[PDB]
Amino acid sequence: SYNYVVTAQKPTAVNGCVTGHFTSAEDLNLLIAKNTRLEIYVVTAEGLRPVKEVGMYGKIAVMELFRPKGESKDLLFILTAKYNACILEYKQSGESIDIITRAHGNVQDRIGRPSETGIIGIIDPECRMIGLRLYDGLFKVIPLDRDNKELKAFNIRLEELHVIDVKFLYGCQAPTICFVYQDPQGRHVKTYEVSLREKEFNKGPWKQNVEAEASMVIAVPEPFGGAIIIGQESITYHNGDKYLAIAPPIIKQSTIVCHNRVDPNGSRYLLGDMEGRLFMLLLEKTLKDLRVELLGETSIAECLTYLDNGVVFVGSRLGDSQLVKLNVDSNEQGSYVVAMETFTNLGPIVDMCVVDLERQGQGQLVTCSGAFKEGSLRIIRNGIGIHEHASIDLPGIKGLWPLRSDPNRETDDTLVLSFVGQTRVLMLNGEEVEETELMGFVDDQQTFFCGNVAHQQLIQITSASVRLVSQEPKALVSEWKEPQAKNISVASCNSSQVVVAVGRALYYLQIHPQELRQISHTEMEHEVACLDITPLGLSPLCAIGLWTDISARILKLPSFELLHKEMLGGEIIPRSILMTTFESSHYLLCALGDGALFYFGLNIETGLLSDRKKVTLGTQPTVLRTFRSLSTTNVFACSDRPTVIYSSNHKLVFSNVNLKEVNYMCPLNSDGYPDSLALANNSTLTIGTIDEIQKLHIRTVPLYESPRKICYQEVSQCFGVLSSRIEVQDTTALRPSASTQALSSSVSSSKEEVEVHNLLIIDQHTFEVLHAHQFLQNEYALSLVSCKLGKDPNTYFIVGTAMVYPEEAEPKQGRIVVFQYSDGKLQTVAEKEVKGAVYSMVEFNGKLLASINSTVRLYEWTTEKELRTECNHYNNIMALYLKTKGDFILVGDLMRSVLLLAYKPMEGNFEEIARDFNPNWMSAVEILDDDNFLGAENAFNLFVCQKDEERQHLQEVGLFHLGEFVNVFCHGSLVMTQGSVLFGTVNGMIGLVTSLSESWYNLLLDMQNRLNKVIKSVGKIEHSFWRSFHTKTEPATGFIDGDLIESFLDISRPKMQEVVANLQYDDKREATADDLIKVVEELTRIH
Amino acid sequence: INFDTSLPTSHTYLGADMEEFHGRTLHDDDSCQVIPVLPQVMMILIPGQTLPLQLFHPQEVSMVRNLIQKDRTFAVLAYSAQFGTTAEIYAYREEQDFGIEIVKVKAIGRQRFKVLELRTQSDGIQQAKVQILPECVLPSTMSAVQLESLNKCQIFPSSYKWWQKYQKRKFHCANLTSWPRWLYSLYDAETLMDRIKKQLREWDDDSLPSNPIDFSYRVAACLPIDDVLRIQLLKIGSAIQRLRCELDIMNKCTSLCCKQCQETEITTKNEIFSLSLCGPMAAYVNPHGYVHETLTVYKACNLNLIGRPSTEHSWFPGYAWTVAQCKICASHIGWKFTATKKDMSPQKFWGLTRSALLPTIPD
């Protein structure tokens, strides 16, 4: 098996946030860590200015800014989870930005038990050294002698094997570290000093049984000195002979988990609760006492950073991050917190599903995201977005035209709108739209075109006539009518050249001052459908599409004589046709009423249409329309599924536009709406800017409780969501939540903190909670599915459950509840008591498969409307995971034991096919196909078992360090390689897995290696080290880092040429840069 | 109960003046070793398990005597072989009384292995080249997923309400995953060891190994199970899977029967109890050098007692033994033990030999 993994969506969860002077000494920076990503901003009055963002080949585990003696600005120390240490510097060389690596080395020890309080990394305030507590019984020291470019470092044995937190202190004759530890007597604080000179600890200034549950340590700066120690109940200062202590009522509620220093003084600190409380702690003065104020509520903070001007960065892992404003203990109101800005954080993605929501043939991902109030559904859609600036209700718009009403202003001030038998004119002044008359333009006739034309004039082309109007002193200066007064049926005009068409006939007029002169006439072999006349001054040809021969055609400049004449096929007519110019070539596009779009290369001199390709874009008819997007032209295909059409290296691309149907559009360049679009649909005119390239767009739906599983019932037009709110014993809520705020509501009729489970029913379009069904007291909802069973036509939400009692370890009882959502409410259609926890379920060939502890059990759905067992299968593992393909069944436990059962219809029971037991923690599994099984496993790895007598063992074909923790896999794709499996992750990264042909695998593997020679890596970390399956540590196999491959496009033109130097390539021969460019761009369009 | 529960584990019936050796020899993981093989001994030795021996044939007497000079470990093969366990000699006794040669050792199983080669020497003794199997250790289920702000709270102060606060504290980050705290608790060494300790507390009050591996191998030896499951347990490399598998065996398996007849209920789980510090079951050698793993229970049924009580060579000093056989098929199931002094408690009990038994789940 040959797989390709790529990032659809980088991790969003913040796990570190530091400030300092990194970019310049004169700039204040905020650095943010999002697992493998490092964002760098500059703090402003206006907010946060982004500056440089980079990935690492590493999970950022330590991130500290420091300034060693005689350096203009701060340097950044980072240590990864694989013990990659680096010192980094910000390098602006001209108009480009780069993060250069001053030093790097791997600080790992061969023999070492990693500490239970994780990696801790600290730098002394003189910047003599870096301390790393990596392992129990050891303290690693990296001296900061400027010659130490390899980060060579020594260890010192600690006596104390269970260290909790540790800092370096301020104001000491020598570098001194302070730390809480635990031995079988109790929890105490100690200090040592650190001599590089001796590579050893000397005993230090002071010591202390401190609070049972003391956890945090804070180095106080030099105005006082000393250390603050936070616990559950206490906050204790310590120093030589000085000592304070408090236990305010306000924090005994939830534990403090993050802190931050507000001023260099050390007067104030920000404290971070585990549930969102944000406190100040003030050091009152010398050092008299400690006051603690409760400032307000934030998102549940992983880290905090005071930014100055009373603004605070709140980094979160469980919900959105924030900038919040603080207020001083003001004369009128107590010090309080206000949310200034929110940044999206998808993770943790705990479950998701893919839904074709818009009906467009475009998947949308809907995730269960967040926890404990930060809980949320997130709707993730792929596309080009429209930034909307104005909206106008006007139904029945048939056409849009921008127009310059004042000839010595360089900018549109008019929008003209056609309706059935009716024309209307909107004038624009800044952002004020007013319908008005345009003298000379008729209003009781349907316009087919208007706009500016040569010799300082406006033209309007009605069904009745072709009016022509003076820019100055507007009035009619010309009119052209059809000989026997017949209606103009199709119209097309440019700068200086009209080509109307009447029924089967078509005339060709030209625009000259105060006169429109008839030049040609002609007939046509069937009725005329659509015209174009675009210059590529005056255009020497004219495109046509016709009604019966269903055919696109080119014509001559005045004669109207056929130049190419291609038959398009089928029974549906042309709807629009467009001669356009992409890249530096010329094309002809033509659209059918059924949604089909055919494109041809064009030859302006001869007329030769070449290389027909087809594509289908949204089944309603399609109007094509030219616009400018950054010094180049695109095409906007107004339809069911609106679409922009650009050309990336001489092959066209169809980025879809992120809107419900657009019928007509035109570009608009006003003073109030510069470089904009005007879109109309059946009910509304919209005015907006447009994004250049595609992106992922995230709609958020707050639940204010934990969502846990989700599935979609298309017939009901709604989502099932298992959720979980926390009440406290009386039992009452802590806040209003999705389940307590539902329209309709219910509770299951029967057979200190508490969890209460519900099945929410949420509207597909509006995401209103329509109903909230509460399960029993002590009942824990585990699994959810929405399916049809047996001969029954009705569709049901089915939930598996378990009965959790604190006395009981392994649950002895549970339920399989079948529900129907039919009225606004939810009917319990059937229970089924079961002697165990229902961990999983799956619709299985019209029957219900379901794990109950170690048993896999198949149920049929009776006409009596009850669940009846067919067969069973007792395992020697616990069936946590259940996935199927056809009659094949995949079972897994938490410990990476996997089975492969098969149903046998002729035999009535299940049979074992294959198995693999290999002890490791498994978080998710998926069936890639009948033979291959994708899984996620401990230390952020992906792995692939393959199927292929004593061949019921499963071969290990795939290994890869992802760097993310996968909760859910699910088959689907967010676009309109073989297969697509999306996965969601704890940091809110989303990834895609697909499969490759061996040929392609081999090519791309070579190319990774060529790439790794050429691409600068931040901590100088080898890509191979990074992707190595790690816990054992082995090279990755049968997995292509698509992120690596995609980075090819970002390298300079010569680095490409270097990468492809003597690369054998199929069609083999010596390959080009442009050969691989168009391959890699084909690979970007799977996600 | 007031019988000295350490008297059994010292095997005084061998004689109590043996030269001792400070037990410590551990071969490297995945290394290869050439170790001799005890002939004439068929058992599945578990790491940590004490194994007493009596050897007569002068080839056996030789190569032990040699082993005392050089490394003291030997191979104890688990038969149809592929897998076994090393055993280190920690006590030696030469004896030429009654005219005849005897060697008495006390070994202790140490490391599991895979067999590679088995060249049998011209002396008559097999010499097994041997791959030392590593002892699979995994981190906490939470270690990967864990919030770094919540690292600081992972160590706790050391009572069923305590286990709930433990479960809430330890597995809080289960909310990031797609499962509950109560599921992660079912794969938690410490929770699993405590649960096993409760079936151990009703057999009976002590201190046992902190280490999940050591604990798991200790409780493996208490289980009266057939030779084939013993091997299932041994092959399981992960201690967590071993502890869960042991919990299962302990809950499900509740009767014990005569292996030969297949339907004669000798005793129940309710009756199992511990007179050895080792546990309710342990290996003892008889006078002829046959090793018996003997599970002590309070009551037994359908046994016939033949011969008369004897204290000769008794494995439990103070008690005399009477041979017990299956009422139906005559199979030597074990021995009834009976007090010699009238104040000892308990007064009587049955010691039933593992090989003759067969654990069952009812219905």
Ligand SMILES: O=C1CC[C@H](N2Cc3c(OCc4ccc(CN5CCOCC5)cc4)cccc3C2=O)C(=O)N1
């Ligand atoms: O608790 C228990 C339960 C009973 C168990 N016993 C006693 C016993 C015998 O008991 C007779 C006997 C005892 C002692 C000897 C002395 N040797 C020394 C070496 O050279 C041969 C003579 C000979 C025969 C004879 C045969 C087998 C067993 C047997 O399995 C046991 O050992 N301790």
Ligand SMILES: [Zn+2]
């Ligand atoms: Zn019998």
